[PDB]
């Protein structure tokens, strides 16, 4: 507590202008200082679960050395809306590693469902998260049903705090073996969908990896990231949004603005 919210930031004004709710957790891994706003509330994961999915695949590959190289064939019926990479390899197949990268870096929906099946479905991914000590995360459904984002529905949700804590364990801590840890980081660094979110608040000369989510309803969208500012320890953070009405629109600018406030609250000059 002593190191939480040392410097107040105007998150309430930001969410009121947005017309909804914003949840933020950010941790300076050097000192342990934190910024926290609505950090223990539940928000829909949307596609942000796909980062944790890829980490679970990497954990399994520690015991199955041939897993990442395994070629996966799939039919046209596997190709749900928003599958920009897997649609180009329908007639050839893709490896498990390639599906993982597509799920992370393009939010590919078909790739995510194929990998969920490999893990034993939503309960299997939830079990991996329990195994690293995350008691908040729950995945319940598959793509696209998990995007419904219904107000008050706990299915397919986590909290900004649990997301950040689990991201830290997987990218900087000991939850993955060292080669798998660096592969997870490298996939996050290569994400293509986050240029207008946390990355928009991060100077270009710092390294960063992230995973986004966009549910398409209830103003619900998000991003989480690891950030390496030069000359100091890394920062881990998560920014989640939602709104009361089904046709309320999400805002990328609001996510970038919340990330800027988080970095300011940690005293990180950007």
């Amino acid at each position: 507590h002593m190191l939480t919210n040392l410097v107040a930031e105007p998150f309430a004004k930001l969410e009121q202008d947005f017309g909804g709710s914003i949840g933020v957790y950010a941790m300076d891994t050097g000192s342990g200082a934190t910024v926290s706003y609505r950090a223990e509330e539940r928000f829909p994961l949307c596609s942000s679960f796909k980062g944790f999915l890829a980490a679970a695949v990497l954990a399994r590959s520690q015991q199955q050395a041939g897993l990442l190289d395994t070629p996966i064939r799939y039919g046209k019926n596997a190709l749900v809306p928003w599958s920009p990479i897997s649609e180009k390899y329908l007639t050839t197949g893709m490896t498990v590693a390639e599906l993982s990268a597509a799920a992370v870096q393009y939010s590919d929906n078909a790739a995510a469902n194929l990998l969920l099946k490999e893990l034993g479905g939503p309960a299997g991914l939830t079990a991996f998260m329990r195994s690293i000590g995350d008691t908040t995360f729950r995945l319940d459904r598959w793509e696209l049903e998990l995007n419904s984002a219904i107000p008050g529905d706990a299915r397919d949700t986590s909290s900004p705090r649990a997301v950040t804590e689990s991201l830290q364990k997987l990218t900087l801590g000991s939850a993955l073996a060292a080669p798998q840890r660096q592969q997870f980081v490298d996939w996050l660094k290569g994400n293509t969908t986050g240029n207008h979110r946390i990355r928009a608040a991060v100077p270009a000369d710092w390294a960063v990896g992230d995973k986004t989510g966009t549910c398409g309803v209830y103003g619900t969208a998000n991003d989480y990231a690891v950030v390496w500012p030069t000359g100091r320890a890394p920062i881990v953070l998560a920014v989640y949004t939602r709104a009361p009405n089904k046709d309320d629109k999400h805002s990328e600018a609001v996510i970038a603005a919340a990330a800027r406030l988080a970095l300011e609250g940690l005293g990180v000059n950007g």
Side-chain angles (χ1 to χ4, degrees):
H1 286 217
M2 172 185 58
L3 300 177
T4 304
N5 296 327
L6 291 162
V7 173
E9 298 294 342
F11 291 109
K13 178 58 151 97
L14 186 64
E15 78 189 345
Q16 289 162 20
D17 288 343
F18 169 60
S21 298
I22 302 169
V24 178
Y25 205 70
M27 187 189 318
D28 182 338
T29 67
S31 63
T34 59
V35 168
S36 180
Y37 185 82
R38 299 190 186 281
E40 301 85 17
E41 296 186 26
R42 286 182 174 283
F43 294 76
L45 289 157
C46 321
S47 292
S48 76
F49 87 90
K50 296 166 187 164
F52 297 120
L53 181 66
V57 170
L58 287 164
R60 179 172 292 197
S61 80
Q62 294 176 202
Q63 298 303 108
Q64 307 181 18
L67 176 62
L68 292 184
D69 281 345
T70 294
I72 305 297
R73 312 193 32 239
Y74 47 94
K76 188 173 172 185
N77 64 336
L79 283 181
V80 294
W82 198 270
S83 295
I85 307 301
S86 56
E87 73 187 8
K88 309 304 180 199
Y89 298 84
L90 177 64
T91 53
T92 66
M94 301 174 55
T95 70
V96 167
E98 289 179 322
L99 291 169
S100 296
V104 171
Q105 300 174 332
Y106 294 86
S107 288
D108 192 294
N109 277 324
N113 277 351
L114 288 163
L115 292 169
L116 271 173
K117 184 193 156 289
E118 290 285 325
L119 292 180
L125 181 53
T126 300
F128 172 71
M129 298 297 285
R130 295 289 179 275
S131 82
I132 71 174
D134 183 332
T135 55
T136 307
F137 178 102
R138 56 185 293 180
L139 203 75
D140 297 79
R141 292 171 295 167
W142 304 71
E143 290 290 359
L144 301 169
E145 290 79 16
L146 67 81
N147 295 308
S148 54
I150 293 163
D153 186 352
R155 290 179 297 172
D156 311 295
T157 65
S158 195
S159 67
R161 179 171 185 162
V163 168
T164 298
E165 289 171 339
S166 288
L167 185 63
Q168 181 186 24
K169 289 166 181 175
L170 293 163
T171 61
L172 301 172
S174 64
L176 295 173
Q180 286 74 23
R181 178 188 316 146
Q182 189 62 53
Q183 179 64 91
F184 186 42
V185 164
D186 289 348
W187 283 338
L188 294 166
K189 284 182 171 193
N191 181 35
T192 75
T193 67
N195 294 338
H196 304 292
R197 295 182 189 191
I198 291 167
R199 281 170 191 267
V202 174
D205 69 316
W206 300 359
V208 45
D210 86 295
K211 178 78 200 73
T212 58
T214 304
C215 277
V217 289
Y218 291 103
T220 296
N222 52 62
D223 195 19
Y224 57 74
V226 184
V227 176
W228 289 264
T230 67
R232 61 183 297 159
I235 309 300
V236 187
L237 74 163
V239 178
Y240 283 68
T241 78
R242 70 180 126 73
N245 301 317
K246 186 175 180 180
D247 74 346
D248 284 339
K249 300 312 174 207
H250 74 276
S251 168
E252 303 204 276
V254 164
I255 295 172
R260 284 190 202 97
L261 292 184
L263 295 170
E264 289 181 21
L266 292 176
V268 174
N269 183 60

